[PDB]
Amino acid sequence: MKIQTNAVNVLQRTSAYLKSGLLKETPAWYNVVASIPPSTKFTREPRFKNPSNGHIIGKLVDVTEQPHANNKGLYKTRPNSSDKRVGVKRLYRPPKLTYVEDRLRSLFYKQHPWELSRPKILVENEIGDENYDWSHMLQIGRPLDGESVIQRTMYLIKTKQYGDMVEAYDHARYEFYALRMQEETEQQVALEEAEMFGSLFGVSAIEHGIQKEQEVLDVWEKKVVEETELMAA
Amino acid sequence: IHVVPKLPNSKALLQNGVPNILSSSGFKTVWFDYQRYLCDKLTLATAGQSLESYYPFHILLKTAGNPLQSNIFNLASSIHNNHLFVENILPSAKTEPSRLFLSKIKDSFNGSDWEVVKEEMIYRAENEVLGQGWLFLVENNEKKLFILTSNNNGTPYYFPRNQSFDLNSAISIDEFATLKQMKELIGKSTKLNGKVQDWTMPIICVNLWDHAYLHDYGVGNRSKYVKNVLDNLNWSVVNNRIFS
Amino acid sequence: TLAELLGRSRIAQVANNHKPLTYTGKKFHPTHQIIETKPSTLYRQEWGLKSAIPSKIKSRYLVYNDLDTLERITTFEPRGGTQWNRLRFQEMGVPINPFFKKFNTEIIGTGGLSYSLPGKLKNSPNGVIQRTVVPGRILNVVKWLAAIGGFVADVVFFQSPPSSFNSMGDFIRMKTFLFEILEASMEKNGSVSMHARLL
Amino acid sequence: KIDQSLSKKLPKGTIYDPFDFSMGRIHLDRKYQDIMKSGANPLEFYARPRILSRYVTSTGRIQHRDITGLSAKNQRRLSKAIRRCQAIGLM
Amino acid sequence: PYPNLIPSANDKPYSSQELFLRQLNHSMRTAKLGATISKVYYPHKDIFYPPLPENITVESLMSAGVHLGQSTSLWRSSTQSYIYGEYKGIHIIDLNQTLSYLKRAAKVVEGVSESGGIILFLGTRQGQKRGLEEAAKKTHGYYVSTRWIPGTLTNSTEISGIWEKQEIDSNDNPTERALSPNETSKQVKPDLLVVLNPTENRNALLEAIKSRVPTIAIIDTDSEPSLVTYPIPGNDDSLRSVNFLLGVLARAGQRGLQNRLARNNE
Amino acid sequence: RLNRIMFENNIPGDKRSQRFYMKPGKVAELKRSQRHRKEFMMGFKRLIEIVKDAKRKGY
Amino acid sequence: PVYRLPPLPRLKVKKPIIRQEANKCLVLMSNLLQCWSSYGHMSPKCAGLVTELKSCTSESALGKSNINYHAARLYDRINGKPHD
Amino acid sequence: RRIVPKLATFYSANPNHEDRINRLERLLRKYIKLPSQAPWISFDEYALIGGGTKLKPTQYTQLLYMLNKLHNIDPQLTNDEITSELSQYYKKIKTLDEFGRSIAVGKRKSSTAKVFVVRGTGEILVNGRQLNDYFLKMKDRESIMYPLQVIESVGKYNIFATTSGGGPTGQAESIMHAIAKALVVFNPLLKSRLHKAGVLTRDYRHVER
Ligand SMILES: [Mg+2]
């Protein structure tokens, strides 16, 4: 769509109306818009750095800055055909944001597919209210999930307590297991202790599933019988 | 996050505890540490879930019927109970029982006096609560006040989680028949969650947990502690808890 | 900066995946992260994704692939079923150790299905529970196959099937049985193989 | 007994939902129902009528790429191999 | 308090209505005992307790999901300068720019409300009525959420000419003066139009251009920025993000109105 | 079964098409037309599947 | 392969096919006639069918798709047309 | 001073309807917790106060839905606010005579009948004549007896029927209708059952060229 002119210049056209006398009374917005001008450039703006990983956008390494033989043993003595092509488009293409955590988020849930069955709430409470010390995994205001493992891993890396991401990730994994075993034992023992004092529950999870299966299976029986009778004819 | 509520006159509570019941280090154990401990555990058990948006009373009502969430229920119960108890022993926010409260005592406890019902409550707590629990004077939908003793973190609101019977030890056929009737009534509900209606509400709550009396009284002497509690209730709160 | 917060944001916490949302092969374990909403946010179609989910969705759970697509929709399914299987397993009590002391993609131990340790007894008002009883459904005439708590398990009989089996036939699944879950291991594919016995 | 189409066999070791016990599951299964789909060059099988008789019809008509699902290059190579096999007295 | 309720007799139990009032008494006093909830998002509070424009951070815009732009396959490249990057197949909106544009637009709303001008809140997506109504009511403004009749501005005589009009004083107090038919028939044009979903409201934007009304809009990755006087780059698809931005603008308008009443009471 | 074989090998269609001679340009344009119609039906079916999906989710 | 279409004047199915549920009466009648063909006329081996037939045809002897609406409603949204 | 549109919904299609719906929604939102347990104005009468020609049937149904929700709030817990807002939208028992008789009139075709039903022992006179004398067809007598047979009260009532006009069938069925109407008086709880029998419905059919 053509860059529109008549939405951002309402003040100028209104002032022409007022000066000519076509409009008698000044509108209520007139002085407000006069004191707060709209942005009227509507330009494409280049970018020179990827915000996420800090990679510089728009630098060409020269042959002088590659004085050493490449992996195939050949020196670089002249520019290649990629260096000679103007790369202005990269300056305007919105950069792809990248985080190592995402590679480490994919791994965790490949190693623990049943951690995907733990429901997650994506509704944020307030990102500014978070004050976490990742020296430990449990945090007040957070659940225990894969992100706890990964944030602890990143903490361990940035403090150089481990040099390799693999070892930090494994350490975080074992702390996560330590906490999960405690939680599951807490749940089981809480239920056991509740039953030992006369807690009378109604439908459990197993009975819930049984009743839903029954609801589905009744309709399935009816359809099967109807289809068999129809097929016979 | 669940946070411990701020109490009226917190400075005096930290300096001199509750007069006639608790010392400063007793009230610190029962409220400024136990309630903090419970709120931290509830936060860790409900953070990142729906329950984090609900008050402990609503949490315990929501999780009362789900067997696997019992731990959350326990926390949500104790927290709630621990503030029902503290609130009605705090010095202030000379209070006396209202005419309506004593009238309902005479209409419930066979026309008995309040002191006699207090002694009955002492006896009930002494016998039917081995170890940890809660003592309640509760009002049912029949306008009847009766004494309820829960073990550990049973709730006074929802009868299937009262936990008024210790099934670790032997029980009388009367208690077993009561459990059978309650199980049948639970099964009688049509709701898929399997919940029932229960309009019982607590009027008086006493914390029989070791966090309340152990430091100031000792391993025994919980009867003395309960007596001190019931002789020194905040009757403004207790009178407000009864529907007019 | 905004980039660091985005890397730490809740959408970023969900690992990228594009597995089909309508898989019709074999399901051994969850493939998609279950997304939950509170009742208050569901009332306002708010799920923490880019776009409001349609009001038709009354369930509080979904799985999704893409926040937005060329079709101007979010690719999602209003299903959170795999959590009820896991919890049902937790109700059974049968346990399944690599949870004790460059990257390996293989499932580690149980893939988060259960963290219960092997040797423990379930006290009950009767007494110590000797064996775990669970309702189930015999599936087909075959070790038979039974649908128990969201898992397909192998049924072994004491002596032989009863007359109800061949009386009903392919409608045997309509009636509920009681099973003892003997054991539960997990194989390399990530599938749990429970062995039970009819009672 | 009932027709096997109207029934659903839940495999062994697989998790399931109550939905799987329904006509919806069977219907969804119906709607959502090799050597050349690899680095192998089909032009090396021109002397192997058994292999490349799988990619023809009962009458011998080469199957369209919509059917075979091969890449364009491997479709072209497979067609060349089949035609060469037909010419050299095989096939 | 509760008229036409007949209590029960002490002999007989509580009735259903007595039980309701009893549990209400419980709810207001003891149901909230045990713990206070902190740092938890409540959807209604964006509407009734929106922050001031000066207190908005990038973090609170991000928690509302304002940064989540359209799919990269639906990009309108004229929005290139508003974009921070792409992540998970969608464009991310630069929230620093969103904050700057939002403060500018909020100041425009405040200035127009302080001048006694007419402010119109337009949003025609499903669950936007509550926020629009509350923004209008706290700015002494106007809103539409059902449908924008094309020609509502450029053909105001044929559409809005029949509805009633009213004379009001400096304090916005109805004077109850009798208007002439000629006065009633005149166009009453908004001084400011704010549209929450400008992509589905091109008619309103074009009418505002023709009728020369300054406009504010939430500009997503697929929306044309030049069609509005004061764009706000942000997510127009999420009710939380939309309500956050709308509540901010409504509070700015409320502050302008309060200042106007303050000086008119001095 | 035999008739399914016949249609699956386009034997009736080939026999009808071999009845009369068609100029190679007309053959080429008919071929282009038929291929376009097939691809149009494939795209139309994809769009209808998207419509059914969106309807089910509630869009 | 994905075959995207050009901008269409419409998105409409010419003759949408519907769920014609078969009449129970006709199925019962066919089963009864098959029974009489196999086991003889007025056979007692399927009197039940006769009864059922009599019960189902007693009062009455015989005992639309929405795809176009949703396709027209959603075409502009899903067609993937580039922005104006 | 300033001329501004009166309603906050002025720029909507039907501002009056939206304003009224907003007030009703506000009340239904303030008092959402109250439990629940109606001659509302007609569509035209609502059109006068709402959109007039702009008013749409779906809008009127929305109005009725809101008004019904508010009205169904438990009467004991309603307040002056709801009732005040709702009021804007709001739009001889028979007995026996001195002789214990229920008098009723029925019509069928061009026939009319006036019946005196008194408690008795199943006697009946028609125009002062025995039933079998006046009505020769048995099916006419069965028609006359049917309402008493519905309530199993043949043998509990004396009937003094008086007919005129039309022919035997018309007179017998007008007596049937009149008897049913008269019988309702002795026990109103049976009206429904009589209404279910079809004997309280006046047969409209008449000779039409
Ligand atoms: Mg958008």
Strand pairing class (C151-156; C192-198): parallel
Secondary structure (H, E, C), chain H: CEEEECCCCCCCCCHHHHHHHHHHHHHHHHCCCCCECCCECCHHHHHHHCCHHHCCHHHHHHHHHHHHHHHCECCCCCCHHHHHHHHCCECCCCCCCCCCCEEEEEEECCEEEEEEEEECCCCEEECCEEHHHHCCCHHHHHHHHHHHHHCCCCCCEEEEEEEECCCHHHHHHHHHHHHHHHHHHHCHHHHHHHHHHCCCCCCCCCCCC
Neighbours of C104 (CB within 10 A): 10
Q: How many CA atoms lie within 13 A of B150 on its CB side?
A: 27
Instruction: Indicate yes or no: CB of H3 within 8 angstroms of CB of E183.
Output: yes
Dig out the tokens for A98 from the structure: 């990248």
Q: Closest CB to C55: pick one of F50, F54, F58.
A: F58
Closest partner residue to A121 among C12, C29, C37, by Cβ?
A: C37
| Triad E23, E28, E33: Cα angle to 5° | 100
Is the Cβ pair H22, E133 closer than 8 Å? yes
Check CB contact under 8 Å for C51 and E238: yes
Radius of gyration over every alpha carbon of chain H, rounded to an integer in angstroms? 28
Q: Between E65, E70, E96, which is nearest C68 by CB? A: E70
Dihedral of CA B59/B65/B66/B68: which sign? Answer: positive
Burial class (CB within 10 angstroms; exposed 0-12, middle 13-18, buried 19+) of G34: middle
Are the beta carbons of E114 and E128 closer than 8 angstroms?
A: no
Residue with tokens 């307030």: A126
**Nearest residue of chain A to residue C114 (CA atoms):** A184
Question: Are the beta carbons of C28 and D13 closer than 8 angstroms?
Answer: yes
Contact G80 C73 (CB under 8 A): no
Residue C195's H or E segment, with its range, is: strand C192-198
Q: Which two tokens stand for residue H176?
A: 């049937």
Two tokens at E219?
Answer: 């500009």
What's the one-letter identity of residue E70?
Q
Helices (H), G1-84: 24-39, 47-56, 67-78
Closest among C35, C37, A148 to B50, alpha carbons compared: C37
Alpha helices in chain A (DSSP H): 10-20, 30-35, 88-92, 100-111, 146-158, 165-195, 205-232
Question: How far, in Å, is the centroid of ligand 1 from the Cα of E220?
Answer: 5
Compute the distance between CA of residue A84 and CA of residue A107 in angstroms, rounded to an integer. 39
Name the β-bridge partners of C185. C193
Is chain B in touch with chain F: ≥3 Cβ pairs within 8 A?
A: no
CA distance between the termini of chain E: 38
Q: Which residue of G has its CA nearest to C74?
A: G78
What residues pair up with C61 in beta bridges, in sequence order?
A: C36
Residue with tokens 């999420």: E238
The whole-angstrom distance between G10's CA and the closest CA on chain C is 17
Q: What are phi and psi of C147, to 5 degrees?
A: -85, 110
Task: Quote the tokens at residue E223.
Answer: 């929306």
E77 burial (CB, 10 Å; 0-12 / 13-18 / 19+) is: exposed
Chain A interface, best mutation among C108, C121, C124, C180, by max A CB count within 10 A: C108
Residues near ligand 1 ion, CB 5 Å cutoff: E 220, 236-237
Give the Å distances, CA to CA, from A16 to A7, A22, C46, E212: 15, 8, 46, 12
Contact C21, C30 (CB under 8 A): no
How far is residue E63's CA from residue A126's CA, in Å, rounded to a whole number?
Answer: 6
Q: In whole angstroms, what separates CA C66 from the centre of its chain?
A: 23
Residue-level length of chain F: 59
d(CA E195, CA E51): 20
Residue B160 backbone phi and psi in degrees, to 5 = -65, -15
Sign of CA dihedral C100, C101, C107, C109: negative
Q: How many residues does chain C have?
A: 199
**Cα E55 to the center of its chain, rounded Å:** 18
Q: What is the Å distance from ligand 1's center to B167 Cα?
A: 60
In sequence order, the 6+-apart residues with CB closer than 8 A to the CB of H173 are H106, H108, H111, H143, H203
Contacts of H3 (CB under 8 A, 6+ apart): E165, E166, E167, E168, E179, E183, E186, E188
Spatial contact of E137 and H18, defined as CB atoms under 8 Å apart: no
Output the CA torsion A79→A81→A82→A84 (10° steps): 70
3-state class of E158 per DSSP?
A: helix
Distance CA H79, CA E220 (A): 46
| b/e per residue H124-133 (b: at least 16 CB within 10 A) | bbbeeeebee
Q: Do E146 and H18 touch (CB under 8 A)?
A: yes
Chains adjacent to E (≥3 CB pairs closer than 8 angstroms): A, B, C, G, H
Question: Residue C146 — φ and ψ, nearest 5°?
Answer: -135, 135
DSSP label at residue B221: -
Opening angle at CA B153, ends B151 and B159, nearest 5: 75
In 3D space, the residue among C192, F46, C152 whose CA is nearest the CA of residue C179 turns out to be C152
CB contact under 8 A, F47 and G13: no
Q: What number of H helices and E strands is found in chain G?
A: 3, 0
How close, in Å, is residue A93 to chain G by CA atoms? 18
Q: How far is the CA of C71 from the centre of ligand 1 (A)?
A: 12
F5 to D61: CB separation less than 8 angstroms, yes or no: no
In DSSP terms, B205 is beta-bridged to: B136
| Residue E166 · residue H6 · CB < 8 Å | yes
H helical segments located in chain B: 10-16, 24-27, 34-46, 56-63, 70-87, 99-108, 114-128, 173-188, 210-213, 222-231, 235-240
Nearest one of E52, E124, E58, E122 to E93, comparing CA atoms: E58
Phi, psi of B91 (to 5 degrees): -55, -45
Give CA B48 to chain center in angstroms. Answer: 28
- How far is ligand 1, taken at its centre, from the CA of residue A124, in Å? 20
Q: Do residues A140 and B44 touch, judged by C-beta distance below 8 A?
A: yes
- Which residue in this structure is represented by tokens 């077993």? B176
- Chain centroid to CA C175: 22
Q: How far apart are the C-alpha atoms of E78 and E39, rounded to whole Å?
A: 38
Is the distance from CB of E174 to CB of E146 less than 8 angstroms?
Answer: no
Q: C54 and F50 in contact by Cβ < 8 A? A: no
- What six digits make up the tokens of A76? 């670089």
Q: Dihedral of CA H43/H44/H47/H53: which sign? A: positive
Contact flag H8-E141 (C-beta cutoff 8 Å): yes
Q: Which residue has the tokens 């408690």?
A: H119
3-class DSSP state of D2? coil
Distance of CA H36 to the CA centre of its chain: 25
Residues of chain E contacting residue G83, judged by C-beta atoms under 8 Å apart = 74, 76, 222
Tokens of B134: 């809660």
Phi/psi-derived region of residue E188, left when phi > 0, alpha when psi is between -120 and 50, beta in every other case: beta
| Amino acid identity, position A149 | V
Helices A205-232, G24-39: axis angle to 10 degrees equals 60
Separation of alpha carbons E68 and E237, rounded Å: 9
Neighbours of B104 (CB within 10 A): 19
- Residues preceding chain discontinuities in chain C with C to N over 2.5 Å: 96, 101, 142
Q: Outline where C33-152 has alpha helix (H).
A: 39-43, 82-92
How many alpha carbons lie under 13 Å from residue C52 in its C-beta half-sphere?
22
Calpha distance E33→B7 (Å, rounded) = 11
* Cα separation, D90 vs B40, whole angstroms: 80
Measured over all CA atoms, what is the biggest interatomic distance in chain A, rounded to whole angstroms? 91
Instruction: Say how many C-beta atoms besides its own lie within 10 A of residue C188's C-beta.
Output: 7
Return the structure tokens found at E79.
């929005």
| Degrees to nearest 5, angle at CA B239 with B234 and B243 | 150
Which residues of chain A make contact with E40, given a CB cutoff of 8 A? 125
Give the A:G interface size as CB pairs under 8 Å. Answer: 14
Q: In 3-state terms, chain C is what percent helix, strand and coil (to 5)?
A: 20, 25, 55
CA distance A85 to A153: 41
Size of interface D-F (CB pairs under 8 A): 9
Q: Classify the C-alpha dihedral H26-H30-H36-H39 as positive or negative.
A: negative
Q: Vertex E59, ends E57 and E60: CA angle to 5°?
A: 70
Chain E contact set for A38 (CB, 8 A): 229-230
Question: Residue H90's beta-bridge partner residues?
Answer: H40
What backbone phi and psi angles, to 5 degrees, belong to A112?
-135, 70
- Among residues B213, B64, B209, the alpha carbon closest in space to that of B129 is found at B209
Query: Which tokens sit at C99?
Result: 């949870």
The method recorded for this entry reads cryo-EM
**φ and ψ at E217, to 5 degrees?**
-150, 155
Residue B50 CA, ligand 1 centroid: distance in Å: 28
Radius of gyration for the alpha carbons in chain B, expressed in angstroms and rounded: 18
